[PDB]
Structure 1
């Protein structure tokens, strides 16, 4: 019952250094294959209060060996671009906007890797995802190369492959653990729809000491070591069983083509 997800990594590079190595890309896949199988050793970092919640999502990934035409592929496309940064607007996902077109989203997880990503408001971001159900054309996840894999251009604290884990979590229908409140909303008001992830005010960054309480979720505090938080790679180490439920519903539903 392991879902094996073929991955295509679209390296979109402007400078040569952004044309990241296979080894860097491979190292990422290797991470995904730990994190999504609860085989990451740092799962030991899970607070004992939550140690029974940790999920094996039962998903593995591999770089596609056949391209959408059935030709052999390394599963990595490399596209030179004159674009200097991409944004959540998905310019990276189209050849026409200086990126690389998605492969069929029902058959591959598209991962675009580019050097710089900005949010709509121009904030530097590490990655972004498209949740299930969106158009195939932009389906997948984008991760900046410096936050991709565990070697090459990957730089701490985003050098343990967790940006992709986090974003693929979104790709698998998981929401930020803190519920993504808008600044004007009560920070305890929104839910990630997952019961076993404690109600959490805001994203955590860096690596909070446990417990990091918010939203009166003491004594245990935020499950900030959940991949759906914003903590540093080394700090997030788990999906919950409740998240697995969502992931399974994703795989059984919008993404059942992967089954």
Structure 2
């Protein structure tokens, strides 16, 4: 029998122009997707090659917008903060009131999700989202997603309009690593591990919509598990976590995030 872990979420919408102050419906659409993907209830799980059907996991996690604020008072579970800031970066400006964002709620009790319009990496690349892995400071714990990649209605835009950026970043929040192993430019692309046996060793990230099989690192004939949420493919293409990943998630819930357990 699975113990379903129910995670309270607070969504911090940080907006400059009115259009970025995204609707309640758009936010709720994201929660709905999380409750499918983390329970193996997404219909598109049918896309997984049958050779790997046996490895598809139900992570046994569900999410809901918080009903009580950190001090025990009724809340919608959504904060909305106007800002004059035109873009945020991975340096966490969105996570502090002082830098034109919104302060985190207590990370031992809530999953903080910030949503903003523009997000850049430290070297100016536009990105869709970023996570903090377990064990970092509470002040910046959580995930950040751009509004055009959040939810399945409103400002969400293809190919990132199926809510999978949040599924991917929350995977990091639960201690999952990129399936290809995150090699640096000069390292052998077959050399690093995501620390999960049942995800095939893989060269580089996959983007777009690859055709099965996509072989790398001598992993034929089945190839890369590019339909795993921890690859970089388009939303419609990523549809599963593995049981080996569930093991890591379980270790995260039993350890550093055990405060979320009943």
Residue 82 of structure 1, CA deviation: 0.7
SS of equivalent to 2:54: coil
Residue 153 of structure 1, CA deviation: 0.3
Q: Deviations over 1:151-178 (max 9, x none)?
A: 0000001000000000000000000000
Partners of 2:53 and 2:244 in 1: CA distance: 13
- Residues 180-189 or 163-172, more deviating: 180-189
Q: Which residue in the other structure is 1:191 paired with?
A: 193
Residue 80 of structure 1, CA deviation: 0.7
Partners of 1:195 and 1:78 in 2: CA distance: 42
Residue 95 of structure 1, CA deviation: 0.6
Partners of 1:202 and 1:103 in 2: CA distance: 35
SS of equivalent to 2:44: helix
Q: Deviations over 1:174-203 (max 9, x none)?
A: 000000111111111111111101111111
Residue 69 of structure 1, CA deviation: 1.1
Partners of 2:87 and 2:51 in 1: CA distance: 42
Partners of 1:2 and 1:9 in 2: CA distance: 21
SS of equivalent to 2:28: helix
Partners of 1:207 and 1:175 in 2: CA distance: 21
2:113 to 111, 114, 123: 111
> What 5-or-longer segments of structure 2 have no aligned partner?
none
SS of equivalent to 2:139: helix
SS of equivalent to 1:51: helix
Q: Deviations over 1:24-69 (max 9, x none)?
A: 0000000000000000010111111111111000000000011111
Q: Deviations over 1:10-29 (max 9, x none)?
A: 00011111111010000000
Residue 135 of structure 1, CA deviation: 0.4
Residue 77 of structure 1, CA deviation: 0.5
TM-score, normalising length: structure 1:
0.99
Partners of 1:73 and 1:183 in 2: CA distance: 46
Partners of 2:100 and 2:219 in 1: CA distance: 45
Q: Deviations over 1:112-157 (max 9, x none)?
A: 0000111111110000000001100000000000000000000001
Partners of 1:50 and 1:97 in 2: CA distance: 45
Q: Which residue in the other structure is 1:134 paired with?
A: 136
- Residues 158-167 or 208-217, more deviating: 208-217
SS of equivalent to 1:79: strand
Q: How does 1:70-149 map to 2 (within 5 A)?
A: 70-149=72-151
Partners of 1:76 and 1:218 in 2: CA distance: 46
